[PDB]
Amino acid sequence: GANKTVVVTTILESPYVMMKKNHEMLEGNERYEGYCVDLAAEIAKHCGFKYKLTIVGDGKYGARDADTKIWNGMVGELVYGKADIAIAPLTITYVREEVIDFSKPFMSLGISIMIKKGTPIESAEDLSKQTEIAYGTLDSGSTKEFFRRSKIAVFDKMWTYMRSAEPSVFVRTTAEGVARVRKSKGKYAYLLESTMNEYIEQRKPCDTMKVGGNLDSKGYGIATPKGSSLGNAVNLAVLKLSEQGLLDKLKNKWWYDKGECGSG
Amino acid sequence: GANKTVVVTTILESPYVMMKKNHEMLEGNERYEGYCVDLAAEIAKHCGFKYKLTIVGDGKYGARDADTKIWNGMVGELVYGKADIAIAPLTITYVREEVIDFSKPFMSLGISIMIKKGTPIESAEDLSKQTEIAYGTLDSGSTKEFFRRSKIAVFDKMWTYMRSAEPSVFVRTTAEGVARVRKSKGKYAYLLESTMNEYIEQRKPCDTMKVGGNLDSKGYGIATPKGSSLGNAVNLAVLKLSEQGLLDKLKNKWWYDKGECGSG
Ligand SMILES: O=S1(=O)NCN(C2CC2)c2cc(Cl)sc21
Ligand SMILES: O=S1(=O)NCN(C2CC2)c2cc(Cl)sc21
Ligand SMILES: N[C@@H](CCC(=O)O)C(=O)O
Ligand SMILES: N[C@@H](CCC(=O)O)C(=O)O
Ligand SMILES: [Cl-]
Ligand SMILES: [Cl-]
Ligand SMILES: [Zn+2]
Ligand SMILES: [Zn+2]
Ligand SMILES: [Zn+2]
Ligand SMILES: [Zn+2]
Ligand SMILES: [Zn+2]
């Protein structure tokens, strides 16, 4: 039938989607800025739709409750028909691709380690062989599920520690994890995606660092409900923006051009 | 109908698919070894099909002739019904995704520069701003099409040079490009995918190296004819094997565990 405004679910996560400084005097999509705000505008332009950015109600990326089988987060908003598309740092995973569609990836990432500068940690293996430095991940996200489901030796060992550690090593938001690194005098390391790690590394007070290689290799995709008619066009739009260099331009714009820790 | 043997198109490109040293005494799929041979066996087992590996008849990856509009290479074998699936270092691109389906990527790559050691080149900009050192790409591939289509100034300048260079700077096979680097005393640099560059860097005589950053960021996907009933299972299998670490293991097996230029 007639064209309808597309409901976009997304998540407040720097530098993907942020409230503008003067957001309180702005309306609708103009309240927000960031990589995914720019990406949404480009996708909509190339696919020919109007859209409304909405922040995911529960603040979560998306995981399935093992007892009720109900999906939360942005994934749930797609599954249950509350949003038409998710444009966010939403990680492509097997279990999610069973219930929603993902475009080809628009950004690469892997799980990585954030330390406060000077922490004597260089790798996941180092973390797994000590207990002085606690370490954890974000809840309801792909990083936690990676460790939970993993049968890889070192990652299995880390999960056995994290799931039982008291007090909890898990956090509800990326910001909470970063703050915990910064205020723990080196006694907490945060496991998070390399994209977010590398962003924070270039933000004041310039006291965190990514260390070691990434633990895996995956990416973020634009997600739609299974079988949605938007999926085909959105997938091609991602590939076009990739081939034009726009994804590279936007990454530089939001990570490094704005960097606060020097011109390195 | 009854299950039928799946025809896999692939290409002789090291270390993805190679003839075994004793292949004349072997039959069928056993004649071949390499990363994509191993991957094909896993994809087939996880999706529950029998398969036959076949080497693409024309030795090409896939490009559309601008006049006849016929697709050649592995893409053509899928488009015209000669093969059911491609399991090969076949690059995801916009123009290909319009006519065939790609799985989520099973390996990352970007266009990169191969030099003979000691060549005074550190970047694509360096190449573009001089004339003593020639440079070119493979034929009928995604790297050539990237330069042909690029609107980025440095890459536009490089294409303007390469398309008019005489004698031709393009090569028919990767081996021809590498041999040209090795015999040109530093006066030829080869533009090829980082995966193949890194592999050759670890092969005797250890006289080439990858220099500079990559020029773009993309990946290889398993390709099927548009609308194939195999695509969904293959896509989920790639993601499962990615999460379980298979892809990282196979990359190390065929690139680095067998490297001939030291334990660097
Ligand atoms: O989760 S994936 O779709 N597949 C796994 N990989 C690795 C190259 C193998 C990947 C990289 C992206 Cl960038 S997105 C994805
Ligand atoms: O050609 S893609 O499907 N999309 C573009 N990218 C870049 C992360 C943006 C990518 C990486 C892969 Cl690995 S596969 C692909
Ligand atoms: N991008 C992740 C959230 C961050 C994390 O889990 O580290 C997801 O889609 O679940
Ligand atoms: N992987 C490329 C071939 C190699 C290249 O173009 O550098 C393709 O699919 O066309
Ligand atoms: Cl997941
Ligand atoms: Cl192409
Ligand atoms: Zn406010
Ligand atoms: Zn655009
Ligand atoms: Zn519950
Ligand atoms: Zn376990
Ligand atoms: Zn297997």
Give the N- to C-terminal CA distance of chain A in Å, as an integer: 52
Q: Is the peptide bond before B225 cis (omega within 30 degrees of 0)?
A: no
Strands (E), B184-242: 188-193, 208-211, 218-220, 223-225
Distance in angstroms (rounded) separating the CA atoms of residues A123 and A187: 15
Distance in angstroms (rounded) separating the CA atoms of residues B141 and B93: 10
Q: Does residue B75 have its Cβ closer than 6 Å to ligand 4?
A: no
Q: Establish whether B193 is an annotated binding residue.
A: yes
Q: Does residue B138 have its Cβ closer than 6 Å to ligand 4?
A: yes
- φ, ψ (nearest 5 deg) of residue B261: -115, 35
Where residue B187 falls (left for φ over 0; alpha for ψ -120 to 50; beta otherwise) is alpha
Selection from B60, B226, B205, B244 nearest residue B138 by Cα: B60
Kindly give the pairing relationship between strand B32-33 and strand B18-19.
Answer: antiparallel
Distance B255 CA to ligand 9 centre (A): 44
User: CA torsion sign, B167 to B169 to B171 to B177?
Assistant: positive
Strands (E), B74-195: 85-86, 100-102, 107-109, 111-116, 134-136, 188-193
Tokens in use for B41? 């066996």
Strands (E), A11-126: 18-19, 32-33, 51-55, 85-86, 100-102, 107-109, 111-116
Q: Note whether B149 and B93 are within 8 A (CB).
A: no
User: CA torsion sign, B88 to B214 to A243 to B190?
Assistant: negative
Alpha helices, H only, A110-149: 124-128, 142-149
Q: Which residue has the tokens 């603040």?
A: A59
Strand partners, A9: A54, A86
Let me know if A28 is exposed, middle or buried by CB neighbors in 10 A (0-12, 13-18, 19+). Answer: exposed
Tokens in use for B52? 């036959």
Å from A200 to nearest chain B CA? 22
A240 touches chain B (CB under 8 A): yes
Angle at CA of residue B14, ends B112 and B158, nearest 5°: 25
Q: Note whether A78 and A213 are within 8 A (CB).
A: no
Coil, strand, or helix at residue B18? strand
Coil, strand, or helix at residue A18? strand
Chain A hits for B98, Cβ within 8 Å:
236
Q: Does residue B202 have its Cβ closer than 6 Å to ligand 4?
A: no
Tell me which CATH homologous superfamily contains domain A1-109+219-258: Periplasmic binding protein-like II (3.40.190.10)
Other Cβ atoms closer than 10 A to B257: 10
Nearest CA in chain B to A111: B243
Q: Does residue B193 have its Cβ closer than 6 Å to ligand 4?
A: yes
Distance in angstroms (rounded) separating the CA atoms of residues A76 and A223: 11
Nearest CA to ligand 2 atom 11: B218
Buried/exposed A123-158: b ≥16 CB within 10 Å, e otherwise: ebebbbeeeebbbbbbbbbbbbbbbeebebebbebb
Q: Is B217 close to A108, i.e. CB distance below 8 A? A: yes
Where residue B120 falls (left for φ over 0; alpha for ψ -120 to 50; beta otherwise) is beta
**1.10.10.10, 3.30.465.10, 3.40.50.2300, 3.40.190.10: which CATH number matches B110-218?**
3.40.190.10
Distance in angstroms (rounded) separating the CA atoms of residues A248 and A250: 5
Distance in angstroms (rounded) separating the CA atoms of residues B255 and B103: 23
Where residue B258 falls (left for φ over 0; alpha for ψ -120 to 50; beta otherwise) is alpha
- φ, ψ (nearest 5 deg) of residue A14: -80, 145
Long-range contacts, stretch B225-230, CB < 8 angstroms, 24+ apart: B225/B78, B225/B79, B225/B81, B225/B84, B225/B100, B225/B101, B226/B99, B226/B100, B226/B101, B227/B101, B228/B84, B228/B85, B228/B101, B230/B6, B230/B47, B230/B49, B230/B84, B230/B85
Tokens in use for A242? 């990739």
B93 touches chain A (CB under 8 A): yes
Selection from B153, B141, B126 nearest residue B211 by Cα: B126
Question: What's CA A15's distance to the chain center, in Å?
Answer: 10
Long-range contacts, stretch B179-186, CB < 8 angstroms, 24+ apart: B181/B114, B181/B115, B181/B116, B181/B208, B182/B116, B182/B207, B182/B208, B184/B116, B184/B134, B185/B116, B186/B115, B186/B116, B186/B118, B186/B119, B186/B133
Resolution in A: 1.5
Buried/exposed B182-195: b ≥16 CB within 10 Å, e otherwise: beeeeebbbbbbbb
Distance in angstroms (rounded) separating the CA atoms of residues B195 and B175: 14
Selection from B229, B245, B252, B241 nearest residue B40 by Cα: B241
Coil, strand, or helix at residue B118? coil
Nearest CA in chain A to B94: A239
Coil, strand, or helix at residue A233? helix
Q: Which residue has the tokens 């993805």?
A: B16
How many contiguous H segments (helices) and E segments (strands) does chain A have?
10, 13
> Ligand 9 is a single-atom ion; what residues have CB below 5 A from it?
A 65, 67
Q: Note whether B61 and B100 are within 8 A (CB).
A: no
Q: Note whether A94 and A23 are within 8 A (CB).
A: no
Ligand nearest to the CA of A111: 3
Q: Note whether B200 and B254 are within 8 A (CB).
A: no
Distance in angstroms (rounded) separating the CA atoms of residues A182 and A197: 13
Q: Note whether A191 and A112 are within 8 A (CB).
A: yes
Q: Note whether A85 and A103 are within 8 A (CB).
A: no
Buried/exposed B100-131: b ≥16 CB within 10 Å, e otherwise: bbbbbbbbbbbbbbbbbeebebeebebbbeee
The C-alpha R_g of chain B, in whole angstroms, comes to 19
Tokens in use for B105? 């990527």
Question: What's CA B216's distance to the chain center, in Å?
Answer: 14
Distance B104 CA to ligand 10 centre (A): 27
How many contiguous H segments (helices) and E segments (strands) does chain B have?
10, 13
Residues 6+ apart with CB under 8 A from A223: A74, A75, A78, A85, A86, A90, A96, A100, A101, A102, A103
Nearest CA in chain B to A98: B236
Method: X-ray
Select from B106, B240, B248 the residue to mutate for testing ligand 1; criterion: most ligand atoms less than 8 Å from CB: B106
A97 touches chain B (CB under 8 A): yes
Distance in angstroms (rounded) separating the CA atoms of residues B259 and B153: 37
Give the N- to C-terminal CA distance of chain B in Å, as an integer: 52
Residues 6+ apart with CB under 8 A from B39: B87, B106, B247, B250
Question: What's CA B55's distance to the chain center, in Å?
Answer: 14
Q: Taking the domains of chain A in order of start, what are their residue ranges? A: 1-109+219-258, 110-218
Coil, strand, or helix at residue B179? helix
Residues 6+ apart with CB under 8 A from A48: none
Inter-axis angle of helices A153-164 and A142-149, nearest 10: 110
> Which residues of B, range 143-172, sit inside 8 Å of A by Cβ?
146, 149-152
Ligand nearest to the CA of A95: 5
Element (H, E) at A160: helix A153-164
Tokens in use for B38? 């191993």
Residues 6+ apart with CB under 8 A from B244: A151
Strand partners, B19: B32
User: Do the two domains A1-109+219-258 and A110-218 of this chain adopt the same fold?
Assistant: yes
Q: Note whether A64 and A96 are within 8 A (CB).
A: no
Selection from B77, B73, B62, B154 nearest residue B111 by Cα: B154
Residue A119 to residues A94, A138, A176, A180, B195: CA-CA distances in angstroms?
34, 21, 19, 14, 34
Residues 6+ apart with CB under 8 A from B22: none
Let me know if B132 is exposed, middle or buried by CB neighbors in 10 A (0-12, 13-18, 19+). Answer: exposed
